[PDB]
Chain A
Amino acid sequence: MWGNLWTEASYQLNFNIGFSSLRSDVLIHLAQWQYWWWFWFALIWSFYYFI
């Protein structure tokens, strides 16, 4: 808190599952990269299922 400007950045709850905050560019880039990294497995995943 800096006046009514809430400079706080984390707001990280207990049982947090991901990054502490997404207000920085590096962490936004990492989050997008991780999501799309998990996107590109479908065929391989499906393949193993049948095996």
Chain B
Amino acid sequence: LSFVYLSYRLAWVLFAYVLIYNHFLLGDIGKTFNVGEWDHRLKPSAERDYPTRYESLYILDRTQKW
């Protein structure tokens, strides 16, 4: 039942978020959206490849791999 209820609650809340944001909150994209990204390890770390909600605490970077 834990998995069932987790799935159902997440589905309902995320679907409500999708509908409300895409119908009512597109006037300011910067306010209602975050810009996120993560790229390959081969390429240098992306500008948006950082943990959200901690932009004022940490600068995230990593060593490239091949």
Is A in direct contact with B (CB under 8 Å) within the complex? no
Interface residues of chain B, those whose CB is within 8 Å of chain A, are none
